Each structure stands twice: as C-alpha cells, then as structure tokens.
Design a protein around this ligand. Structure first.
Ligand SMILES: NC[C@@H]1O[C@H](O[C@H]2[C@@H](O)[C@H](O[C@@H]3[C@@H](O)[C@H](N)C[C@H](N)[C@H]3O[C@H]3O[C@H](CO)[C@@H](O)[C@H](O)[C@H]3N)O[C@@H]2CO)[C@H](N)[C@@H](O)[C@@H]1O
Ligand SMILES: [Mg+2]
Ligand SMILES: [Mg+2]
Lengths: 149, 221, 137, 125
RNA sequence: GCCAGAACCAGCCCUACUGCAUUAUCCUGUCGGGGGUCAAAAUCCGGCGGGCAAGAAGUGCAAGAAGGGUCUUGGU
RNA sequence: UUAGGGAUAUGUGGCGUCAAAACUUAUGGGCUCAUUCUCGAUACGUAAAGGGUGUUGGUGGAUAUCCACCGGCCCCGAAAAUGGAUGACGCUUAAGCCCAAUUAGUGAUUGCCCAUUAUUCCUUUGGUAAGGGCGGAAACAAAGGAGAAAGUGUAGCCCUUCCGAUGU
RNA sequence: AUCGAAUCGCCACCUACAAGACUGGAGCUUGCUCCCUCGAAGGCGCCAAGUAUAUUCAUGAUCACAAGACA
C-alpha cells in the first residue's frame, strides 16, 4: 500500500544530484514540494525537493511540521528509522550499484567467478535432485520411456 | 513466401543451420497508437527488424465515438474518377498500425521501403511468435504513464470492428485459447521454477565462502 | 632531455607491473602484464605470461592497451633491449622462460596473488549489454 | 544427460556495435563530409565524449576478391570483405550520438542503417 | 614518388583548476502578542542583546602561465 | 547578403516520426476535452455581433449560502458545389495554449541542431595596394639541386604582407 | 556447387497473465501500525565442467573484416 507524504515520512531521492539519498520530510510546501532534511548525511541539508523526485518509504518518524533541526536528529535516533531502512533489500540494491559503479576490472572478475561458482553448484545440485524426482525435460522423457522400453 | 528449391538445395549443399535474424518483438497491449508508432518508425529506420504483436489492444486517446468518426472522415476520401486507384482504407488494427508507421517513414524512397518491410505487425500473438523469446514493451508509450487516467481512451480493436474489420471475434477466440493454453503451461514448470530457486539457495553454503561475501557486496545473494 | 632514451611521455597508468588488456592485434582481449617500456619513447613490452594466457614477450604500444588499477609489483629481470625484436629462436625461447618463471615467482608472493593468476587467464570481451565508457579499470 | 549450459568461448569482440544513422544535414540537405553513428548503450553526451578519437569501421563485402592487407603474409584473410575506416570526431546532440569522419573519403550511403563497429583503441585510460 | 599506425615539435581551436568585492527586508538569542492544538512547536508581529547563514549565496567583477583536438595547419 | 575549399561558432527557425537536434529534457508552474471539412497549433497571412448552470481565476456587495460585474481557455453562433489537408502521420502525464528554465533551492558562465553570415586556417584572383631582394658574398669537376629578368600585362623577376571578390 | 563474403546473445528457468487511484499478506485508529518472502534484478554466458601450485599457446614479429564463427 502507498505511503503518504506527511511530516516525518522518509523519502529517497529519485534522480537529482543525489539519486539515492534518504531524507525526512520536515514540512510540506504545497501540492508538489516539500522540505527534506536528513541530519545524518552531509549532502542532505534542509533543501526543497519536488515531489516528482521523491519516493516515500514505509518509515515515518514522529516529528512535527517545520521542526527545529535538532529535534529532528532526536526524532530519527529514537525511531531507528535509518537502521531499519539499512537492512531492507531495496537499500541493499542501492549500495550494490555503488560497488558496480566503482568496480575495477579485477573486482568485476571476482563477481564473475563468484557467479560462475554459484551457477556451477546450483546446476549440480539440480542434477543430483533430478535423478531422484524426474522434473526436468531430460528426466521426464526418460522416465516415460524406460517404463515401456 | 516459402523458400524455393534453389533456396532449399543450397541449405542442403552447405548444411545450413536453422537461422533466425535478430528480431525485436513488441507487445503493444495498452500503448499509445502514435507514440509507439514513432518509436517503431525510428528503430526500423536504424536497421532493426521488428515484429509487432497484439495490435487490437492499441489505444487512441478520446471517446470511441470520436476516433471512429475520424476514421470515417478518412474513409470519405477516395479518388472520385477511379476509386481503384484511390486511397486504400485498411480496417485491421494490424493494418492501421502499419499505415501509421508508414506515414512516419520516407515512404517514397528505397530506404523507407526497406524499413517498412522490416515491420510485420500481427494482431493477437500468432503461434510462430509465442515461443520465440520474451516480448518487449515501450515504457515511454504505455497509456498508464502517457494518458491522464480520468480521460477516456479507445481500444483499437473496438474502433476498427465498427468501421469494417470482420475478424474481431476470430481474434478474440484465438487469444482466449492462447491464455488458457499458456496458463496451463505456466502451472507446469512451477515445480521447475521452484526447483532451481531452491537449488540456487542451496548452492550457497555448498560453494566457498570467499566467493559469497563478494557475491553479497554486489548484492547478488 | 627529449633525445635521452629515458625520455618517456607514457601515461602514469601504464607502469611496470600493471595488468593490461590487449584490445587489438593477435592476442586481443587477453590480460598481459606490462614489463617495461623500450628506449627512445618506444613501445611497451608485455609478457602474458605464456603459462597463463598464451601471450609471449611482445611489443605493443600504449594506445592499444587499457591499463587497469591492478598491479602485481614485479621487480624482475630487464635484459630485453630493443634488439631481441629484430629481423622461435633459441635466444628468444630462453629469454621467454627466464622472464616467464620470474613472473609466476612474483605473481604468487603477491597478497591475493592466486586471485590475480586467474585474472590473467580470463578474456575481456564486450558483452551485448555493457558500457565500457562508465567503468573504472 | 545432465544440465550443461552453452558457454560462448568464441573469439572475443573488442568493439562496440553501432549504426550509421545518416549524415549531418539540415532541412536543406546533407553534408556527406561527416557521418552520424548511434552506438549501443551510449545515450548521454558525456558518454560520447569517452569515444571521441576512437577508430571506426564499416565492414561490407564486394563481389571480387580485391587486395587487402597481409595479402602475401596471411593468405587466409583474403576475402571479398572490405572495410572503410574513420575516427569519432565529436559528440552530436544530447542523446549520445557521435560525429565520425572516414579516412580520405565518406562512408557509402548504402551503409545507412547498417552495422558500424567502433573500437576501444586509441586508448586513453 | 604507395597505404596505414604511433611518437614528438610548433601553431591554433576545446574544456578542467578561482579570486576580489557584496550581504541586514538577513542570522541568532531570549521577554512580550499572536496563533493553532489533545496539550505546543511553528507560520506572524514587536522590544534590545549579540552577530560570519560563510562548494554560504545560483549576486557584481573575474586576470586561476594545463588534460583533449588537429584525416581542424606546418614540420621531423 | 554571395571568389574556390575546410574547422569552429552563430543568426532566423527549430528539437515525436518524416528530418539534423530534448534516444518524447527538467529533479518548472498553470490552463484546456472539442461526436461526420472532424479542438488546437510557426508572425506577415485573407469571421463578427451575441450567448453558455462547461471549467478556471478576479473584483465589489451582502446573510457556509446567495447577488451584481470582469478576465483566460473551451463550446454555440459557424451553410456550398473532384477526395483533402496545423505540410503529413499523429498528439490529449501534449507532440496544444500562456509563462519560464538548462541538467536544477547543488554550491553561479555557454542544453544542441542547422547557413554562400561571423572568426580563423589554405588556395586563387584583382588592387588608389604597401614593403624587401636584384654590383651573382666566398666556395664547389665527373665517376645537396636549380633559379635570380630594374619588371603594366606571361608558364606572372623572386619573396613577404594587407584588403576586396555575387550581379541584369 | 558455384560461394569468398556483410551479420557477432545463448536458453525445454525469459518466452503466462492482468494492474498502475496499485500489484506480498493482514489489522483498524483509513493513515498508520504489524508480519516474512522486506515488495528496485528471468536465468545464464564473458576461457580449468569451476576458484584449486594445471599442462599447450610465440616467428601471425606493433593497428588493419575476428586470419576465428556448432556457444
Ligand atoms: N564519379 C565517377 C567515378 O569516380 C570514382 O572516384 C570516386 C571515389 O571513389 C573517389 O574517392 C576517392 C577514393 O577512391 C579513395 N579511397 C580516396 C580518395 N582520396 C577519394 O577521392 C576523393 O579525395 C581526393 C581529394 O583531393 C580527390 O582526388 C577526389 O576527387 C575525391 N573524390 O572520388 C570519386 C567520388 O566522386 C572513380 N574515378 C570512378 O569510379 C569514376 O570515375
Ligand atoms: Mg535577399
Ligand atoms: Mg552582361
């Protein structure tokens, strides 16, 4: 279910000069702009974001409208909203591109030998479970063959 | 066009593997008629081979009565001296889309005729197109991002059945029979789709752990 | 100083020890290690080593090489002048193996040095969906 | 009998696939002096500045086997295949197209819409 | 006296790296009078106490002696 | 505003396809729905009076509701003789109208596309053209080379420099 | 059988289907709280059949259509 724009609602910036940074709505200007501040991040000082560039998250600190910029740092510390976000899967996809957009050619090789490992293991586990149950196409056709040939 | 015996003996003298060219297949369900036609008219002219599918599901903005009158104003045009030499008024949704692409091409040169014969434009999904790869989509033309949802729209298969196009019900029984068939195929292999993903979660901890915290740095766990 | 043989104008990324990508020539897409640069602003000289990817001691220039961040820190023998490469001879077959085995000696004493020996056997190709203009190397 | 994938251990490609879009032109007609190449996955003007200076090839064939390079040294590359060469000179627009010029001539107009390979050499990194 | 590639000079064309001034109808501090609220923080107005909002401003001027072009010139 | 050619940058006009450019840009704001010559849309350039409880703003009165006015877009007013035209397709989270930006409350410059224009680099040609050199400096065989004319005009005496160039 | 050619991503995991005023599941204070599958990846492929002291590669000599091309 969609998450409403309210004072305290954590938004992630979509495609500004920030592109991935989370921020807390501290005031709503009108039908298309809010004030966004995250004291934990350096680039996230109290600025004005258009609501076409925000993405509301499921987390919402209990803070009031037009906060005092020091009770905001108190509000997201007691709520632990930044740490609950930091273990979601969508936040892991944000920090994963930051490795891909900073990877050297050697650690792109390490990702390729990691994926070819897991792929080699998942296809030999799939081998030694398809001998027991005839699931795959090689094993359905041979099971419906040896029973009458 | 079936291949002739000169084109069949050379595929036996030379042992020709079965070849398929690089063909991009667009699923045009819920697309803007002229925004999809302009994306296609540029890609065909950049040398893309494009099969277009499900043309009875294209949308045109406005009331169905509005877009049906604009076709009937188009059908009002004919060469009065000899209408066999006139504008030819195609009623199929698959042929409305070929025209709308063609009117965005340089139609009267050879480069714009090599690009309009690169487009195929079926309606429904025919049996040769079904199992040839995942269909693609044009996300800048998809009616849920391009039309304001309070405004009416017009399905092209419904505008065209009331101006001609006597094969509306044939397409509706060929696509009812497909989605019944393709959903029987998809309840099948659900113990093959779950077989791999319970083997790709089991491949972890059967693989060395120094290749897993590099597989968790890039988020591929 | 420009007429001196130690005058180079070569990039700071194409240092000795820097693992390269060949991009052209016979052994394109392979990963060879940059040994040194020939005098009078000469071309680079890369060995593979041949034990790993099949690239011998050969001349290549800087503009046909992507130099990456990964070094192996060679301090090996440099007795490859501008004249073993002049008009396999048993000299070049001996000069190969004497520098070949000095590479694997220096590959393995590197930290994460077995990961780099496998890195020299892989092949760089351009996949149908990847962007080499947005990559760090 | 087991699940063995296909692996693509062919010869590598060290080029980027592009398309000859056409030429520089206005409303008034073409300037065949310089050509326009849309390269795949290059879509921003910053992404075309990386490729400025790279070498560019249009591979085609003729009808007869005319004389290529290494005709005497390597008689296995003797082919009906020809090639025209060029350089990316500058970006063209915001959308990541390049403005290339071929060596000493222009690209044939038959090449419009056909495959052009742009390379990674001359290297800068 | 043919075709390519790189190198290095010079010239010319690109783009990186920024300083000097200016803030005040402004910043901050508390007591009011005002607001709304479950209570109250804010918007708002006013006292005199301090001030530097400091890659701080999209405000005035900028002189910061390169990395890339040159099948965009000549040369070795 | 125009010698024969390149490179860069513009102008008028543009950037959904035709058709180069916003691979349909913004991390800008509003307004607009129109059902048989089919809303609208590049000036010059070839429908009015009047009307609307369509929508969107304003102004002045009165007791959450009424009253008088004024504006924007849209509709009505609006009927012709080959089939027909915002140039065509189309567009309606505009690709329309009015404002505004330039990669976006991030930290200051110029988003980019097109000329017989501009700047600059070559070559030609002509000047109310402007300067220099022209007393062979020495020296040099074959088995470093040739030229050097006191000149309107040449295959121009030879160099350097500057400006102009279309036309019945 | 002329024929040398241009093309360079494979899959019996995509190759089913709707939806965007929603589309993981529920609560009731209907905009917030709560649950795990955490709601932003179709898998592979990119040179040992798989991350481990394993064994060919030159002389095709410094770019040239990749001189390869059954994945
Ligand atoms: N149009 C007639 C044809 O012209 C042909 O030549 C045509 C082209 O092939 C030719 O292009 C050549 C090209 O072959 C070769 N690869 C390089 C050469 N530099 C090009 O020539 C071009 O550049 C130079 C610049 O001064 C000029 O000599 C030439 O006029 C110009 N066309 O120039 C002509 C383009 O109009 C052949 N002579 C012949 O097929 C026939 O005569
Ligand atoms: Mg005039
Ligand atoms: Mg006359």
């Amino acid at each position: 279910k969609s998450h409403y724009i309210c004072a305290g609602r954590l938004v992630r910036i979509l495609r500004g000069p920030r592109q991935d940074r989370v921020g807390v709505i501290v005031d709503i200007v009108d039908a298309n702009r809010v004030l966004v501040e995250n004291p934990e991040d350096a680039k996230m000082w109290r600025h004005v974001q258009n609501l076409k560039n925000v993405e509301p998250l499921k987390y919402c600190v209990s803070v009031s409208r037009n906060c005092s910029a020091k009770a905001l740092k108190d509000a997201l510390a007691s709520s632990k909203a930044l740490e609950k976000y930091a273990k979601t899967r969508t936040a892991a996809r944000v920090e994963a591109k930051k490795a891909c957009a900073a990877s050297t050619d050697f650690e792109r090789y390490q990702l390729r030998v990691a994926r070819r490992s897991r792929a080699h293991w998942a296809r030999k586990v799939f081998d030694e479970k398809d001998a027991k149950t005839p699931v795959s196409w090689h094993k359905v056709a041979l099971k419906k063959m040896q029973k009458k040939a | 066009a079936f291949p002739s015996r000169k084109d069949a003996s050379r595929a036996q003298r030379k042992s020709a593997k079965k070849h398929r060219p690089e063909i991009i297949v667009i699923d045009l369900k819920d697309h803007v008629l002229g925004r999809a036609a302009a994306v296609v008219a540029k890609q065909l002219l950049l040398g893309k081979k494009i099969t277009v599918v499900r043309c009875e599901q294209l949308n045109i903005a406005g009331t169905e009565i509005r877009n049906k009158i604009k076709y009937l104003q188009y059908l009002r045009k004919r060469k009065l001296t000899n209408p066999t030499k006139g504008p030819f008024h195609h009623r199929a949704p698959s042929d409305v889309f070929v025209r709308t692409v063609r009117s965005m091409l340089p139609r009267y040169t050879k480069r714009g005729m090599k690009a309009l014969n690169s487009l195929v434009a079926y309606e429904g999904i025919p049996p040769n197109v079904v199992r040839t790869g995942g269909r693609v989509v044009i996300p800048r033309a998809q009616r849920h991002v391009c039309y304001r949802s309070e405004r009416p729209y017009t399905v092209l298969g419904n505008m065209c059945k009331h101006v001609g196009w006597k094969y509306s019900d044939v397409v509706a029984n060929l696509e009812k029979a497909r989605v019944e068939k393709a959903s029987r195929h998809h309840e099948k292999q659900a113990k093959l789709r779950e077989a791999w993903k319970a083997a790709r979660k089991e491949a972890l901890a059967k693989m060395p752990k120094h290749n897993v915290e590099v597989l968790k740095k890039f988020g591929y766990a | 100083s420009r007429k001196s043989p130690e005058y180079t104008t070569l990039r700071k990324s194409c240092a000795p020890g820097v693992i390269a990508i060949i991009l052209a020539g016979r052994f394109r897409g392979r990963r060879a290690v940059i040994l040194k640069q020939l005098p009078h602003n000469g071309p680079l000289v890369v060995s593979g080593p041949m034990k790993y990817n099949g690239v011998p001691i050969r001349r290549i220039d800087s503009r046909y090489v992507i130099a990456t961040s990964t070094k192996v820190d060679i301090s090996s023998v440099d007795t490859a002048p501008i004249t073993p490469e002049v008009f396999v001879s048993d000299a070049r077959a001996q000069l190969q193996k004497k520098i070949d085995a000095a590479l694997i000696a220096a590959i393995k004493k590197d930290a994460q040095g077995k990961e780099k020996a496998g890195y020299l056997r892989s092949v760089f190709t351009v996949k149908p969906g990847d962007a080499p203009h947005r990559w760090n190397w | 009998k087991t699940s063995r994938v296909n692996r693509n251990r062919k010869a590598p490609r060290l080029y980027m696939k592009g398309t000859l879009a056409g030429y520089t032109r206005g409303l008034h007609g073409q300037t065949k002096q310089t050509a326009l190449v849309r390269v795949e996955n290059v879509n921003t003007r910053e992404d075309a500045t990386w490729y400025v200076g790279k070498r560019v090839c249009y591979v085609y064939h003729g009808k007869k086997v005319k004389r290529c390079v290494r005709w005497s040294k390597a008689p296995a590359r003797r082919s009906t295949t020809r090639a025209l060469w060029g350089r990316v000179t500058r970006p063209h627009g915001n959308a990541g197209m390049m403005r290339v010029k071929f060596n000493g001539a222009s690209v044939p107009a038959s090449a419009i819409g056909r495959r052009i390979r742009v390379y990674l050499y001359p290297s800068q990194i």
